[PDB]
Scaffold this active site. Structure first.
Site, PDB file in Angstrom:
ATOM      1  N   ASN A 187       0.773  -1.197  -0.130  1.00 44.95           N
ATOM      2  CA  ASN A 187      -0.062  -0.154   0.110  1.00 44.95           C
ATOM      3  C   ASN A 187       0.651   1.341  -0.095  1.00 44.95           C
ATOM      4  O   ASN A 187       0.272   2.396   0.131  1.00 44.95           O
ATOM      5  CB  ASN A 187      -1.018  -0.074   1.273  1.00 44.95           C
ATOM      6  CG  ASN A 187      -1.939  -1.325   1.260  1.00 44.95           C
ATOM      7  OD1 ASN A 187      -1.780  -1.930   2.247  1.00 44.95           O
ATOM      8  ND2 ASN A 187      -2.362  -1.555   0.172  1.00 44.95           N
ATOM      9  N   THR A 201       4.857   7.401  -1.491  1.00 38.96           N
ATOM     10  CA  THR A 201       3.297   7.899  -1.012  1.00 38.96           C
ATOM     11  C   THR A 201       2.796   6.873  -0.421  1.00 38.96           C
ATOM     12  O   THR A 201       2.566   5.693  -1.128  1.00 38.96           O
ATOM     13  CB  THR A 201       2.819   8.756  -1.931  1.00 38.96           C
ATOM     14  OG1 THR A 201       4.010   9.896  -2.329  1.00 38.96           O
ATOM     15  CG2 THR A 201       1.518   9.371  -1.557  1.00 38.96           C
ATOM     16  N   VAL A 202       2.077   7.015   0.790  1.00 37.31           N
ATOM     17  CA  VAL A 202       1.300   5.925   1.355  1.00 37.31           C
ATOM     18  C   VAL A 202      -0.061   6.279   0.871  1.00 37.31           C
ATOM     19  O   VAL A 202      -0.824   7.131   0.867  1.00 37.31           O
ATOM     20  CB  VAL A 202       1.307   6.192   2.951  1.00 37.31           C
ATOM     21  CG1 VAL A 202       0.307   5.315   3.662  1.00 37.31           C
ATOM     22  CG2 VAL A 202       2.800   6.039   3.586  1.00 37.31           C
ATOM     23  N   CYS A 203      -0.676   5.138   0.343  1.00 38.11           N
ATOM     24  CA  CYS A 203      -2.083   4.803   0.079  1.00 38.11           C
ATOM     25  C   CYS A 203      -3.019   4.251   1.416  1.00 38.11           C
ATOM     26  O   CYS A 203      -2.847   3.276   1.835  1.00 38.11           O
ATOM     27  CB  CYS A 203      -2.271   3.930  -1.084  1.00 38.11           C
ATOM     28  SG  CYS A 203      -3.996   3.884  -1.365  1.00 38.11           S
ATOM     29  N   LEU A 204      -3.359   5.420   1.990  1.00 36.07           N
ATOM     30  CA  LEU A 204      -4.331   5.167   3.290  1.00 36.07           C
ATOM     31  C   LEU A 204      -5.403   5.975   3.363  1.00 36.07           C
ATOM     32  O   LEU A 204      -5.579   7.141   3.182  1.00 36.07           O
ATOM     33  CB  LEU A 204      -3.369   5.342   4.501  1.00 36.07           C
ATOM     34  CG  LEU A 204      -3.689   4.894   5.891  1.00 36.07           C
ATOM     35  CD1 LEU A 204      -4.229   3.477   5.804  1.00 36.07           C
ATOM     36  CD2 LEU A 204      -2.708   5.294   6.889  1.00 36.07           C
TER      37      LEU A 204
END
Ligand code: NA
Lengths: 157, 79
Positions: A84, A90-93
């Protein structure tokens, strides 16, 4: 933005008082000693009792002038092997989206803790990184191996 | 005056300089200074000639001039 800066000053004061053990979150200090609260250099300790334990993973946190109505962008530097996190770092959250689960009430502590938890338990609904993701799903053994080597690579030494 | 340059000095001998109207409430100056230090508004106190600067004090009221010095301190000290 007075609204963004007034909130980030509250955030920084509260962090200084009390934050979760092992976590780092330091706003950027300009060469002249003045502060840039729109850019924070952070670190997430890998969760205890998991293959992430021992790793200390640097993440940058960037705020926009419409903070706290907007979320920060959270970027691992360097990018991490994890389903993720995009190849970019870049974090997908979901708590990092206004249209998903970001709300003004979410603090830097909860952001960093949210991301530490994500490290340990991936969302299979978001393949941000297809090779980490495919290995997670189809070869948990190789996944765990790579996670431990990566924790080891980023262990304070 | 129409604008006067005010100097804000802390314990470390650092200075930040503001161009302000005599007419304008000094809250804006305080607000900006705090911002540059990355600390809340309620955490710093600003003094001119040894007296606290209120939000609704103006340089005209307190008799301030070009190059005057405002000393800034941590509340308590805290903060
Ligand atoms: Na968003």
């Amino acid at each position: 933005s007075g609204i963004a800066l007034s909130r980030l000053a509250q955030e920084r004061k509260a962090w200084r008082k009390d934050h979760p053990f092992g976590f780092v979150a330091v706003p950027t200090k300009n060469p002249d000693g003045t502060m840039n609260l729109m850019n924070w250099e952070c670190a997430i300790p890998g969760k205890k009792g998991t293959p992430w334990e021992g790793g200390l993973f640097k993440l940058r946190m960037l705020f926009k002038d419409d903070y706290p109505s907007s979320p920060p962008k959270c970027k691992f530097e360097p990018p991490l092997f994890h389903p993720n996190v995009y190849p970019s770092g870049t974090v997908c959250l979901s708590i990092l989206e206004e249209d998903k689960d970001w709300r003004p009430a979410i603090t830097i502590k909860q952001i960093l803790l949210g991301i530490q938890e994500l490290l340990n338990e991936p969302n299979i609904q978001d393949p941000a990184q297809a090779e980490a993701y495919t290995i997670y799903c189809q070869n948990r053994v190789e996944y765990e191996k790579r996670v431990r080597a990566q924790a080891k690579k980023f262990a304070p030494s | 005056m129409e604008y006067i340059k005010l100097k804000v000095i802390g314990q470390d001998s650092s200075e930040i300089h503001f161009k302000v109207k005599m007419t304008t409430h000094l809250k804006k100056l305080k607000e900006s200074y705090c911002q540059r230090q990355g600390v809340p508004m309620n955490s710093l106190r600003f003094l001119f000639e040894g007296q606290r600067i209120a939000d609704n004090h103006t340089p005209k009221e307190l008799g301030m001039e070009e190059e005057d010095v405002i000393e800034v301190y941590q509340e308590q000290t805290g903060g």
